């Protein structure tokens, strides 16, 4: 009974990073090496675990977070990073146990004239806690005058569009990202590698 990674990696639509998606993976055999040995991925990085030993490990549950960011932001999806993505959108903890997987999605996620669908949070007064998700759309007060829900001077919509165009430089092209978090509770393991 193999883990249904297909439903995550091959989903037609991916979330905007501010509204990142989480899927719980449970009660299955996880052949991580299939993904690790894949030619599909430009990033495959693990933390708290050896990438080559993944097929040997058991966890209570696995969580798959997925979303789109730009190429040069993939490096922010790692413990101990800062920037618009790590600070205001998707934050991994220092003690993260899991893998970060990314691939270029310019062919699916860019549009002629710019894709205005993919958003990130630009304005937030404080950084996210690890694994915090903020989907609020309150007008951001950048001065001492209240906004009263109305966009204008010093009163900003907090989300910005990437505006992905197929002609963008690679660092500015959309990348699909999957973060696998490995959860260990005091309970029987439900997700094991085939070579356990």
């Amino acid at each position, epitope marked *: 009974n193999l883990c249904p990674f297909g439903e995550v990696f091959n989903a037609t639509r991916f979330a905007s990073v501010y509204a990142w998606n989480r899927k719980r993976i449970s009660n299955c055999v996880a052949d991580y090496s299939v993904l690790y040995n894949s030619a599909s991925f430009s990033t495959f990085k693990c933390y708290g675990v050896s990438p080559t030993k993944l097929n040997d490990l058991c966890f209570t549950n696995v969580y798959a977070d997925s979303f789109v960011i730009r190429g040069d932001e993939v490096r922010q999806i790692a413990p101990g990073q800062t920037g618009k993505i790590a600070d205001y959108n998707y934050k991994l903890p220092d003690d993260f146990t899991g893998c970060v997987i990314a691939w270029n999605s310019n062919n699916l996620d860019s549009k002629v004239g710019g894709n205005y669908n993919y958003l990130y949070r*630009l304005f937030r007064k404080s*950084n996210l806690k690890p694994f915090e998700r903020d989907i609020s759309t309150e007008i*951001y007060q950048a*001065g001492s005058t209240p906004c009263n829900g109305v966009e204008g001077f*010093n009163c900003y919509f907090p989300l910005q569009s990437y505006g992905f*165009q197929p*002609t*963008n430089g690679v*660092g*500015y092209q959309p990348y699909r990202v999957v973060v696998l978090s490995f959860e260990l509770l005091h309970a029987p393991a439900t997700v094991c590698g085939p070579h356990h």
Partner: antibody
Amino acid sequence: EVQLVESGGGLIQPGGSLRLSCAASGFTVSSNYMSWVRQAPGKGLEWVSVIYPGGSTFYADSVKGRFTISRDNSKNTLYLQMNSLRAEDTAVYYCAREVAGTYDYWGQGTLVTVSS
Amino acid sequence: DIQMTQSPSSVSASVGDRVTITCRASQGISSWLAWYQQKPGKAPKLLIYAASSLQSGVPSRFSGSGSGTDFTLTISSLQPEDFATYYCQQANSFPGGTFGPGTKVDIKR
């Protein structure tokens, strides 16, 4: 009326340190992306440092390790602390408020001359 | 390591002339491109953001166009007060904005 008033530039020997100030009114410094941009005499504009509303800071490769951007909320002021200054750092330094990567308001500039 | 270039490096034009200056990014940057005017001894002033949007308070004779790698700033009818260095700026670079080298405009008469 948005105002950014800079201070603290002057003459400094090579290897010396200097702190620039930028007192803001008309927006809240701590709520904004704020940058320093410099211009060496007769040359173009060079972005040098940024501080994010949540406190993250970043620096141009040309100044990394030597400069520190900071702010004081109570004084609504932005600072740039510069160390190990060299002739290449001689420039007018501007502070600017940044909105989606563009600089809508700028200070008047402060001249830093690095010379013995 | 995007390079921003501008052309021509200088232009001399008469009052009332249409002036067209060019900015190029070495890789596509969509519409994330700003234009500034810098008078001698003054801070730059934002003219154009998002490649084509005119900043509040800026005269209507200034306009921007283009998307991707090639951008243009146009002064439709040059005024004597318009001598300056005009800079484009990539607005989506990290960690900071990336300025072009500037085009100097002077008034012919």
